[PDB]
Amino acid sequence: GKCRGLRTARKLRSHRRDQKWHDKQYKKAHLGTALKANPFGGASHAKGIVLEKVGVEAKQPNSAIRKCVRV
Amino acid sequence: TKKRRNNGRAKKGRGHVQPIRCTNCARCVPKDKAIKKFVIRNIVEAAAVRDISEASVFDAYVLPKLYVKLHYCVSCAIHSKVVRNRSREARKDRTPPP
Amino acid sequence: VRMNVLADALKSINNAEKRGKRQVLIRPCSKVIVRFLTVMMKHGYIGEFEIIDDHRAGKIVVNLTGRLNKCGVISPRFDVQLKDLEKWQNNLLPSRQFGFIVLTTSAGIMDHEEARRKHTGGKILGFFF
Amino acid sequence: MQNDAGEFVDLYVPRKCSASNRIIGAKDHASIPMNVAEVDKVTGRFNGQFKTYAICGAIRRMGESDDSILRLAKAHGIVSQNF
Amino acid sequence: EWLPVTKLGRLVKDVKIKSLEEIYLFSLPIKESEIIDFFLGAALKDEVLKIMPVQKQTRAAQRTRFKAFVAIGDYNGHVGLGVKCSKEVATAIRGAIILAKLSIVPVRRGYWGNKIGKPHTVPCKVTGRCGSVLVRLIPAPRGTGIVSAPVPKKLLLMAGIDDCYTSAWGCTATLGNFAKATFDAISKTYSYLTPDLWKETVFTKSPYQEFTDHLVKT
Amino acid sequence: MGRVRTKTVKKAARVIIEKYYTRLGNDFHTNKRVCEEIAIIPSKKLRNKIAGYVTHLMKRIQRGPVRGISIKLQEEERERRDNYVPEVSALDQEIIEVDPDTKEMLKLLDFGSLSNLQVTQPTVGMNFK
Amino acid sequence: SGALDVLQMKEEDVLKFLAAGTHLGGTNLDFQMEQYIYKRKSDGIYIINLKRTWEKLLLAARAIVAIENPADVSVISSRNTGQRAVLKFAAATGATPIAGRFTPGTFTNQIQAAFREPRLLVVTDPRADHQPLTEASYVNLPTIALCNTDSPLRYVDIAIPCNNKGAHSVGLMWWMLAREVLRMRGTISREHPWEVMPDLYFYRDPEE
Amino acid sequence: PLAKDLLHPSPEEEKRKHKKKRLVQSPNSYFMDVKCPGCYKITTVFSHAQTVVLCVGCSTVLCQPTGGKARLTEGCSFRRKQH
Amino acid sequence: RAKWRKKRMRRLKRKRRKMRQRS
RNA sequence: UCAAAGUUUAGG
């Protein structure tokens, strides 16, 4: 079971520390990784110039063209 | 799901057993596993027994018997119908048939 | 190993009460055990017990009366600061009406209510109701 | 049950097993209240008044009811010193 | 018209037992649904919590039949939680109501701290669980309301529990199991053996004894 | 290779015989006509069939009792033959046999009546594994 | 029971018990029944404290007597020893018998033809008469039962330690239970003997 | 079951326990005052001897110490009575 | 099959070790 | 007292 005792604090708090990385949402937000992969460099929106109107094709159970813009 | 408390393999307190080559498929099997008929059997059988009793020299005479321990593996045991399958309840009856 | 004695004693009497016993024999014994059990007696949860001296640790036999729901123990023996005792009794007893939190103190072993009266924090031990 | 005024409340007050102080529930349908008749002393012969004992549904199914009943009798002087 | 085919029912019809509190006391099972409706005439209201449609597979397509979780309660000390499955939903609901009626139970209620007025919240922190879904009720102070999920809130209201803090864990989403858990919690509210009890019991006759001369009907 | 009687025959036959045991007999055509009068059997074929089984139970009855039927005279005969009382067996003459383990039994309850004491049997080894 | 003066042992009763052999129990002792035993003999047969038997037998009576209308003491045998005895007991006592093939749910189903809601059951052999015993836990039905060494004491509120195997002892026990429910209350002396023979209650294995 | 006087257990069910599991942990063993036939000196042997006990005159051997209680040499009587 | 996908992967790793040892 | 028997609209 758990470490539980009274001068454990370190083991307890450090074990939590090591595990927090196994969380998915947290590793996203703490390894820089995703901010690097964001085109919107950690941003709510981004201005960008259109350079071709591209029809996207929808995923199977729906059939439809989705008219996107290459920015 | 775990089909049997046993695991069809009466082991328990060992963690290794010597194998057995099956007396049919030649398959390898744990000894603690594997269906095992012991077959004592009159050599001559019902048909000729009286024919040989007639035409034996030795007066009266008790014949012999043929003694064989088989070692059927699971696959083969079921095929030859040494052992049928059973309902989940009837699986837990380790008395033999008569 | 046999690490904390109190914690197995109370567990022994809680197991007994659960199966509907009349008396129950708790094996290694202590001051603390006898002080905890007496507190449980003063509020009528367990009946009058006795403490068999072998010339060693000792044993204790305790007569129950089916009033004792759960009698537990808090390891570690955290150090409750009287301010904090309200929180404990919220998240440890079943109601603001019965149940006790026995915490050892300068002043001695007792339930929380005596400790609040005597205005004396001290380390937690367990609880019963 | 009483409120702070001393006025009783709570729509009833449950029975409670004679052999475990264990409150016999609203819907414990394996319970028993068992009337056991007394006698006059000089003649035997059922004498009006009873001795009653409730038992929880748990104890019965545990298989411990008859020992517990037998113990309750011999406290109350129905039964007479089995030894 | 009611022709009671039980012993208990016959007594109730003859105004012999004055309250269903007497029936509860001796754990005599209520079998006939007329007894309960008689004793709780009005106040008793039936709220269809959910209609889950089940089904099962035939060689010939599939059989589909419905399942009506009814609760029932006086908003004043008694609640039931009947379930019934039928080929057509109205029949499931009519049967569900009757099954709730057969398993209404006397909810204890308690005070919070200061013990004044009439009991309003729950006694001790009772819990009740069923098939993963655990429901924990917690006694709460006046005017809080029922801090709870929809299903329990509707059943707890029916019990007549003005104030309650609640927790749950498990697949609460299984409405039936979540109602059945909350039911087991408020079932237990009486069977918690507080000091408030403890007093050695009296023991009385039980209607089957008292009116055995009436039941040998003359 | 076929003709079993249905339940709709068997029942009618059974119920007929309960009531009109006396009228009915061994010959078929006799009771075939009895079946007509006492019972409103619709089809002639059904009648003919009920009667046919009715003979067959009559034959069975004339040779001990049948399980699924109540003939009034047989029940009265059963009542006379299960309220028998001989000169009594639970006294078991004078001299009842007893063991030393069942002697001492009596010494605990204070007795010394006419009962012969005898054992030898050394613990054999009960059943076989 | 109160084996205090009037309803004490007497020689003539013990001698009947010994003849039937209700003391001579079985080989398999269940840990509930240990309570009601003197010893185990040679071979392996336990012996049943006949005082202890009496006391329990008397208790059962005081329970059956407290039942204020005798007809709502149900009495049951599934086995072919008690079927006659329970029938004669019910005649003697004024009870209702359920001799043979107890229909599952006579104590449940409002609906049923053979619906009954008694205040007490009196079992023969709780090992065999097990369906009614369990139904006695859906209804709030206390129980008497003639238990052997083996007989496990599930649900039985007041066990009578006997030789429920042998038909004699079975009969004898029923006849004894009848005497004392009759004697306590009814139209029997105790000083005088009883007109009814115990041979009445015994099962007749096809003989004539 | 459901009720056992743990403080007043009967001696028929204390001797049938383990030497440690009794209410007060006792021993199962004893000293014996061994006589022997020739040499009149009465030795004082312990039931579980483990040593091979030679006499005080040192002529004979008293006990061949087995696993259990020691094996006394044929004509060698003895008395418990103590403590 | 899992076992064979491991063999696949261990052979392909072996090919990658071999490519990179050319530099 | 064990031959061979692979496949199955995108078009709801």
Next chain:
RNA sequence: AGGUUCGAAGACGAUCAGAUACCGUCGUAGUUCCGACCAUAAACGAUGCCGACCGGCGAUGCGGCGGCGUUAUUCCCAUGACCCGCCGGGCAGCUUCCGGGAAACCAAAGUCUUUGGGUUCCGGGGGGAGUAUGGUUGCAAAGCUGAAACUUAAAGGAAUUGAC
């Protein structure tokens, strides 16, 4: 060092549309012994280790204790082999409304919302992936440690009715 048997590779014979496979005939490494590596398996009870308590029943293996009768050996002794007990701790079993559990099941997987005996390891939708990358170990084969982008609404367990 050795090489009977079997037998990856390989070679033929069959079977098949095909069979580089299953069946048959050969047959290398290996299969064995000695001396060095390797360090992984469904290395499984898929169940960490110590400690406590909480129901029955029969069995079995070791040690001890007690007991009337057997076999005997020779005339008792000592026996040893049976017999019926109890104790301690073993491998397991059946049994139950112990109590758990999503359950199947488990006297443990119980004594958990009435949550705290101690302490280790360890998981956090499914894939990518035990991949890449470094570091390290190995003669090697490999092992240990071990990401990410990108992808995706499920994948998964137990159990029910069907169909096959």
